[PDB]
């Protein structure tokens, strides 16, 4: 699953977690199996 978010919201993308990104558009299962991988993209996605 591939997408962009503001850096403050990276902590919402987990099993069990809650917030506007975790509720309203990207919810993980509360027993998720897998990895969440992220890096800053300020060199590509900012203008």
């Amino acid at each position: 699953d591939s997408f962009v978010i503001r850096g403050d919201e990276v902590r919402q993308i987990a099993p069990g977690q809650t917030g506007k990104i975790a509720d309203y558009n990207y919810k993980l299962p509360d027993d998720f199996t897998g990895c969440v991988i992220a890096w800053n993209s300020n060199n590509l996605d900012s203008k």
């Binding site: 403050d8 809650t18 917030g19 506007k20």
Partner: protein, 50 residues
């Protein structure tokens, strides 16, 4: 206040929504103990202090 001095508001006789604070971009932490910040709106207390 200075951290040696720290004032203490007592909150009483009133209604509050805690989700307004929990969804705010203002805060660098929100760590909760003995209650969860998602649950506070469903639950209530004799005094609250800040």
């Amino acid at each position: 206040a200075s951290v040696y001095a720290w004032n203490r508001k007592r909150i009483s006789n009133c209604v509050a929504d805690y989700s307004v604070l929990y969804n705010s971009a203002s805060f660098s932490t929100f760590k909760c103990y003995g209650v969860s910040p998602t649950k506070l709106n469903d639950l209530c207390f004799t005094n609250v202090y800040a």
